[PDB]
Design a protein around this motif. Sequence first.
Motif, PDB file in Angstrom:
ATOM      1  N   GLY A  64      -8.432  82.225 -17.648  1.00 43.78           N
ATOM      2  CA  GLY A  64      -9.355  81.439 -16.553  1.00 43.78           C
ATOM      3  C   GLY A  64      -9.526  80.115 -17.223  1.00 43.78           C
ATOM      4  O   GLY A  64      -9.431  79.210 -16.157  1.00 43.78           O
ATOM      5  N   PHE A  65      -9.481  79.639 -18.333  1.00 41.62           N
ATOM      6  CA  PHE A  65      -9.663  78.487 -18.756  1.00 41.62           C
ATOM      7  C   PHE A  65      -8.310  77.576 -18.408  1.00 41.62           C
ATOM      8  O   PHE A  65      -8.100  76.418 -18.413  1.00 41.62           O
ATOM      9  N   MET A  66      -7.144  78.428 -18.559  1.00 39.14           N
ATOM     10  CA  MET A  66      -5.909  77.896 -18.200  1.00 39.14           C
ATOM     11  C   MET A  66      -5.725  77.616 -16.694  1.00 39.14           C
ATOM     12  O   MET A  66      -5.017  76.849 -16.388  1.00 39.14           O
ATOM     13  N   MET A  67      -6.262  78.585 -15.948  1.00 42.65           N
ATOM     14  CA  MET A  67      -6.415  78.443 -14.366  1.00 42.65           C
ATOM     15  C   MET A  67      -6.666  76.950 -13.934  1.00 42.65           C
ATOM     16  O   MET A  67      -5.916  76.363 -12.884  1.00 42.65           O
ATOM     17  N   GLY A  68      -7.691  76.487 -14.647  1.00 43.62           N
ATOM     18  CA  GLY A  68      -8.056  74.906 -14.485  1.00 43.62           C
ATOM     19  C   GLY A  68      -6.774  74.070 -14.665  1.00 43.62           C
ATOM     20  O   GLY A  68      -6.627  73.087 -14.109  1.00 43.62           O
ATOM     21  N   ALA A  69      -6.198  74.088 -15.995  1.00 44.09           N
ATOM     22  CA  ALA A  69      -5.092  73.438 -16.235  1.00 44.09           C
ATOM     23  C   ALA A  69      -3.864  73.249 -15.453  1.00 44.09           C
ATOM     24  O   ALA A  69      -3.381  72.535 -14.896  1.00 44.09           O
ATOM     25  N   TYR A  70      -3.665  74.708 -14.694  1.00 46.53           N
ATOM     26  CA  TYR A  70      -2.833  74.876 -13.612  1.00 46.53           C
ATOM     27  C   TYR A  70      -3.004  74.273 -12.442  1.00 46.53           C
ATOM     28  O   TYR A  70      -2.308  73.436 -11.950  1.00 46.53           O
ATOM     29  N   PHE A  71      -4.212  74.242 -11.969  1.00 42.13           N
ATOM     30  CA  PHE A  71      -4.713  73.729 -10.620  1.00 42.13           C
ATOM     31  C   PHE A  71      -4.658  72.246 -10.748  1.00 42.13           C
ATOM     32  O   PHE A  71      -4.172  71.460  -9.739  1.00 42.13           O
ATOM     33  N   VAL A  72      -4.998  71.596 -12.125  1.00 40.61           N
ATOM     34  CA  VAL A  72      -5.015  70.139 -12.178  1.00 40.61           C
ATOM     35  C   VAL A  72      -3.601  69.793 -12.264  1.00 40.61           C
ATOM     36  O   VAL A  72      -3.136  68.685 -11.927  1.00 40.61           O
ATOM     37  N   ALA A  73      -2.751  70.317 -12.937  1.00 35.33           N
ATOM     38  CA  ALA A  73      -1.242  70.109 -13.148  1.00 35.33           C
ATOM     39  C   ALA A  73      -0.624  70.081 -11.716  1.00 35.33           C
ATOM     40  O   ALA A  73       0.303  69.132 -11.336  1.00 35.33           O
ATOM     41  N   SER A  74      -0.951  71.129 -10.880  1.00 34.83           N
ATOM     42  CA  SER A  74      -0.391  71.103  -9.532  1.00 34.83           C
ATOM     43  C   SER A  74      -0.960  69.721  -8.621  1.00 34.83           C
ATOM     44  O   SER A  74      -0.180  69.293  -7.793  1.00 34.83           O
ATOM     45  N   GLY A  75      -2.282  69.580  -8.672  1.00 37.39           N
ATOM     46  CA  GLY A  75      -2.887  68.399  -7.914  1.00 37.39           C
ATOM     47  C   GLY A  75      -2.262  67.152  -8.559  1.00 37.39           C
ATOM     48  O   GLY A  75      -2.006  66.253  -7.769  1.00 37.39           O
ATOM     49  N   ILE A  76      -1.979  66.930  -9.921  1.00 33.94           N
ATOM     50  CA  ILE A  76      -1.450  65.598 -10.455  1.00 33.94           C
ATOM     51  C   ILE A  76       0.170  65.919  -9.862  1.00 33.94           C
ATOM     52  O   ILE A  76       0.514  64.447  -9.552  1.00 33.94           O
ATOM     53  N   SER A  77       0.923  66.673  -9.748  1.00 31.41           N
ATOM     54  CA  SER A  77       2.099  66.829  -9.262  1.00 31.41           C
ATOM     55  C   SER A  77       2.284  66.224  -7.819  1.00 31.41           C
ATOM     56  O   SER A  77       3.134  65.873  -7.376  1.00 31.41           O
TER      57      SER A  77
END
Lengths: 459, 459, 459, 459
Positions: free
Chosen positions: D390-403
């Motif tokens: 769950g807490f990593m889901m944020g990191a994945y979402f932000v990583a995709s947005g940054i990309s």
Amino acid sequence: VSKTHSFMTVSLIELWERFGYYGMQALIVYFMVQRLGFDDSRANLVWSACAALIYVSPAIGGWVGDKILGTKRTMLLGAGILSVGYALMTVPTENTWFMFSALGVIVVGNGLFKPNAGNLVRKIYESKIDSAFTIYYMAVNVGSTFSMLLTPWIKDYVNAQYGNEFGWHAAFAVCCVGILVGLGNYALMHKSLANYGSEPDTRPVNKKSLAIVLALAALSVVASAIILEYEDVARVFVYAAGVAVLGIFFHLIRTRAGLIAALILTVQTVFFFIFYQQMSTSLALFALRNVDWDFQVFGTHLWTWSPAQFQALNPIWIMVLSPVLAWSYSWIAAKFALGFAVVAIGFFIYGFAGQFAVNGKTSSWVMIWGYASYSLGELLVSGLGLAMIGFMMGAYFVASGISQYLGGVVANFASVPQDLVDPLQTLPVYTNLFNKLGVAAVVCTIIALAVLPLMRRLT
Amino acid sequence: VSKTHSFMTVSLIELWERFGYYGMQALIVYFMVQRLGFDDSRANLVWSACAALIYVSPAIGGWVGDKILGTKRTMLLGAGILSVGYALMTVPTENTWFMFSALGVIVVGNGLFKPNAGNLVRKIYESKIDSAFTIYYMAVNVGSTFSMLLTPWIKDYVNAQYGNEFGWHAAFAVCCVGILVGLGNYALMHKSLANYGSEPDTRPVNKKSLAIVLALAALSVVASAIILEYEDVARVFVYAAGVAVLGIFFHLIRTRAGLIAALILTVQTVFFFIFYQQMSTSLALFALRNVDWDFQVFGTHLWTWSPAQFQALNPIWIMVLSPVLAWSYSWIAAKFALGFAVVAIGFFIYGFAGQFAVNGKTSSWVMIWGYASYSLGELLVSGLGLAMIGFMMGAYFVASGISQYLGGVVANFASVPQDLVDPLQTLPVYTNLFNKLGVAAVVCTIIALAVLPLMRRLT
Amino acid sequence: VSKTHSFMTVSLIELWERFGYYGMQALIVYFMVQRLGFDDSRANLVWSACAALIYVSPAIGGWVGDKILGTKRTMLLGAGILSVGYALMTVPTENTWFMFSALGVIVVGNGLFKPNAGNLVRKIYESKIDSAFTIYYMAVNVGSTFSMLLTPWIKDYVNAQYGNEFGWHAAFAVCCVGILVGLGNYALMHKSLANYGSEPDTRPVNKKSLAIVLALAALSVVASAIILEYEDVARVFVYAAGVAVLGIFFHLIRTRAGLIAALILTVQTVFFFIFYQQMSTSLALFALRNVDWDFQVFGTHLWTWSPAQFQALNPIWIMVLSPVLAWSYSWIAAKFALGFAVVAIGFFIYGFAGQFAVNGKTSSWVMIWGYASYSLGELLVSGLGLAMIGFMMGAYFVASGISQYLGGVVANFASVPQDLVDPLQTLPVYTNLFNKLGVAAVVCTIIALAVLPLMRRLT
Amino acid sequence: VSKTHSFMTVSLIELWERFGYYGMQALIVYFMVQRLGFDDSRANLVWSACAALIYVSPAIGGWVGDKILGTKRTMLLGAGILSVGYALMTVPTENTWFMFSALGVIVVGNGLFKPNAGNLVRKIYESKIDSAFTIYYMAVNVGSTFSMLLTPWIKDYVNAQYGNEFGWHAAFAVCCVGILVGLGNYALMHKSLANYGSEPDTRPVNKKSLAIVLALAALSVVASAIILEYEDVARVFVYAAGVAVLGIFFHLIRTRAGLIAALILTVQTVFFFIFYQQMSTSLALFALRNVDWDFQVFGTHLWTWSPAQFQALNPIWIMVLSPVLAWSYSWIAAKFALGFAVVAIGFFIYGFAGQFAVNGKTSSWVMIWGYASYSLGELLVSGLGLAMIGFMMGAYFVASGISQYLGGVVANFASVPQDLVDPLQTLPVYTNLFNKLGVAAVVCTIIALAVLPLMRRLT
């Protein structure tokens, strides 16, 4: 059990026999054309009638081997006869009756040897006879490849270094000494095959039956040589045998369901042997007169072919593709139609040869990809005669033999007069025959594909 | 049981009927264009309305055959009517009402023959009726191939040797004598079919119903000839039937889940018959005016086509590819989309024809690979009307019939004025229609592929 | 259990060792040719004899690691020896005996390191050792890819910025510091591997055996350097070892069924290593002299190669294709023949290079698609030595080592004199060798495909 | 149960929303370039930062919809916000802050609409939610296809007939009226969705939380418009979020086996969105300046494209290929590598465009086969974020947005100065970027294929 070793001895003598025969077949058509003065339209019909006799001869010899004489000694008798035949080929004469006598001796010798060698191969393994026959056919292929690559080069080399005559007759002596090597190999290793025999091999030799078959063999040699010499005699004999086959079918039509399917399967069989016989007749002449023997891959000279060595591609591709089919089959008479289509694309390969390469002679890659297709078709449509349905087995054998001769007259559609040495002008007649033959094979593909619901009805 | 023999007799009379009909269809469009003075834009619409009548006629005849008269005698009645039709075609007149009377007789005769022949084929096997129908359809294909190859060559040959008129009318006499050969074949072998019959065939003939259907058949011949003659009458009748189909759908929409899937499947069916009808209309004209009939494979002259014999490639490729699909299927309304794509690549084959070969006329290989694709699509999208869902079956039949006419007006997009004999200038209009039609078929492919989740919802 | 972490430490030191070795191999042939004054015909034989020594060295080192010394310390001993070897390579001398001493040290160090690293990888997982070995071989590939891409560019860059000598010796120092990085990595993480050991690692070091192997290692370095220096000494040693292999086979022939199959499988193994050794020898020279290093995709300049970095395509394609085979295998010594055919089409790729691109130098895409085929064959024919049948294992190892040298003399078929700098004239000899080598590989394909019935006999 | 009808109502309002959004997306980049005076290097970064905001916005809106407000009314709130956004787009001003205000309103509206529409689609079916989502995504694709084909043609037509400004703003009004049509459709059919609701939808509206989210939405619109306006603010925000993602990973590295696999899968995800974002940025500019909109098949004029309608090929090919994959899958994170390879061959398609067609503008078929490959890759690598851990889901979402933003700066590698109108000179920079990007995607293919043993270790 060392039944494998008895199988090795018969495979060795069989390999050397096919060595002798195919070393002779690859050169016999060129021999009638180049050394002998035969025009190709006659050499085609003479070889084709001889091919018919050679094909239907094992029926008589196989019955003599297990019912009249011993399978072992009848096979040895045919081997010694074939020794006389190739030794008759090796004497340097321009005599037509000399070669005809040699060819008749070849017919009788093949008939008395081949079915008995295969008969006792069945005897050794009493049903992994399929496993033995696969290694058996493999030894046949590798031996014929050696001869079909060797004897034409012996012909070229001996003629180049020794003038004119010695080439062809040295290669026929190579076929003769090949038979003698196998016989010497048998005389040393016959102990393993002494245990397994025929029904008469339990008992000693009967000299009445021996004198009968020996006088009949001589009478059969005379009959075969006369059938070959006079073409009109071969025509009437083929016609009479054709009426006989048509008779057997109509006589059995009087009874009769499911046999109409075998009748159809016999019709396609006749069509097939008209295509396959072509690769030994006109394709040989085509390779002799309209193929650049200079073989170069990507602009680098490897070698220059001899037009007879091209027929060695038939056994090669068989050994290349028979494992391919095995795995590809891992991961139904309609497979006839597949062979029809592959034969079609093979003829269209030779028709393609006209487009890309024109110097009067097409490229040599034509022979490679051609024999690839022809052997591929031959691969997946061979053995259909073994699955028939006894009295009809004769009609099928005669029908296939007759079709060998009929394919020989089809090759006469591309017979070149001997006053036409310009390959620029001999290329049209070859490519025209092969192109319309490919059309005929596409017609046969349409026939078998459309008639498949009849086959599914019969199962 | 010899039910196979009863099946052989009906297959023989059916083969000869399809022989007569397709020997007539392959020439009817060229007959209206070349012999008759019709401009192609009218010959397209007249044949298309006749194709609609022929397609929806078996519904009435199939019901008459089992509920009003006997299936055997109604089939024979339609056969004798078709005999009158082709005999009406064979009299040498330039009269429009003569051909229209013959075409109306053809419509009634087809409707009274075809569904009853197939009905008692179902009766014989009571469920291997699929096995019988496969051999049944095979006999249909091989008979139509013979006629579509024969009757156009009869037309060419008889016109060449006998002037002007006798060609077309001799080929129509060939269709007539073909019907008479099948009727003579039936008169000899009707003993096997005497046991299996319809519900009324148990009882003798009713002359009230016979006089009713005979007067109605004549009244139907008059109605069909008038629908064909005046194009505006055909338009209003198609429009009224279209409102009727739209009515049946909306009326059933009032109820209604899962029928929306059949509604979609009917929409694609209309699109499909606009493509398949094209190959009989504009593709025939295209083959008549912009295809080099000189057929040569790899630079060797085989023959020169007749532009009507091209339609014989539709049955040929069917018999070539129907076994292919069987094995390929061994080793789901989305198969509509596959047929859409194969129809698309077929139209793009004809568009390709513009590039490679330009002399005013494209190559003849265009017709071969074209009909390969069209028959392939036809192969894998035929029979969808049999799997519908009774009252809607009428709406589907009428929708498919209407789409035959609509495809005929689509062929008018490539109608050439009769003052334009330059094939250099008639090639653009053909290739332009076929290219944008291929685009339309790719659109239909996108439609069916995108709507597939709706289909998976309904299962 | 953290056995994964012990596996990570050995994988790290193994990765850095293969980093050092392949960073040296990619340059050693160019080093003998360009920096040293060796003519290519000698540099081919010297590297080939060194490749034979490197290949058969792990047998002695693997036995020393588990029977004489500890597997961990014998691996560390070989690592320190390889450190001395690459440090011997990095001193700037034009001395032949300097490089030969370094190459002999490399042979002893490889033999004492490689089999023991793989031995304790087997020890850690006691049978998912296949899972560990897959990740193990993956770390080997990615490390060799880094080095084979890095050390040739270091050579180019350092020579460009610093003149003449420093380039080659800096890259050999890179190989040396790579060994030292792995040793420093081991000195930090050896705690995990301390639990798993060899049989002698249970006990402390034996200084008798240590002094024995150290003096023998020095004696082995001298023996290897003398075998490399004088080519005639390498020939006699290869011949004597060849008679030894022929001896072991005939000695075991005296007993002996099923071993003839391994004998055949050893024959093909010799043929295979003559092909695979070529890609390190003549293909390197070919890439050095007849490949345009300008790599552009669709007309856009990406980079310019260094001819040694081409060998990095062998590990790359392995990591690209080893997953391909896995899934493709999901959805039998005949796979030798498949590798023969893929090696054949790889040589024919290089022969193709002559046609399309001629400027004296072929395109660089030749190296890409080439190494794709070579690594593909190498992929599906590697590991056959592990499935043999102990005393014969030696004969197989020696046979493969001998074939490394024999492939080196086969590369001398395309040896260019050092007075011929025109690439327009060095292209023929390369393309001619590669084309006839592809023919030889097609011959090997025919051999294995024809001999398959022998293999099926043995199962 | 008529849960299908509740699903039809939400699918209708969702279809019209995606109609509005994609009718706006296809034109927004051309709108910043052509109508507004933005140089492409700024329009690339502004859209890319907006794409990042739009992509990560549904996370906040999906949580607000089920925990703070009602999922139904939060979806309606986002729909009304998007109505304000497109109505803000349709007023004819050259004001930068006008479009930026509209884009910020679009970000907030998308975030509050999209996840809640998909949330209650999950609510309706409580697990055939996959069946519903497939029809759901199908309705999304067909609606976006309509808009992306319609709104660019509205722009061309209205500008042609009405001068200069009205075109772009009429198409943005089309997006606005599309939202209003869906809202009117919802106001009529909201009875079915009244039964299924969120957790707060059981209770009436909370005006505290309503005023909170409304003031925060306005504050979020201001924050998004300022992030878009000043590029340097977007850089620092992307960098800070990048350090945050790197922080979450290293913080979780401290614990941690198997998460390294998700870490690797996140790395590839960043690479992937740099490729996929390109097709909206530089590929749009490339289609605007270096693609011949004249679409002709086999030499026949069909139509002339509008460079924005090219993006409609992404939904089309999805609906074309998603059934293909289904059947092809019938008859494992390595499918990332497959998408890498398909993305690679897509970029190499655009590099190929340079060779065949050169007039300054490549052919239009480039866009068709290109988007075929890009959508194919997108097809088989989408949904990997749903299978994380769950807490990593944020990191994945932000990583995709940054990309998304990082891909926007990668598109600046092919930014053309606005003083260079010669397409002969703008073709090199486009083809050079696409060719080296295809090389980068082949690198990514090698990465994922080589790292697969790590993945198999983790299972």
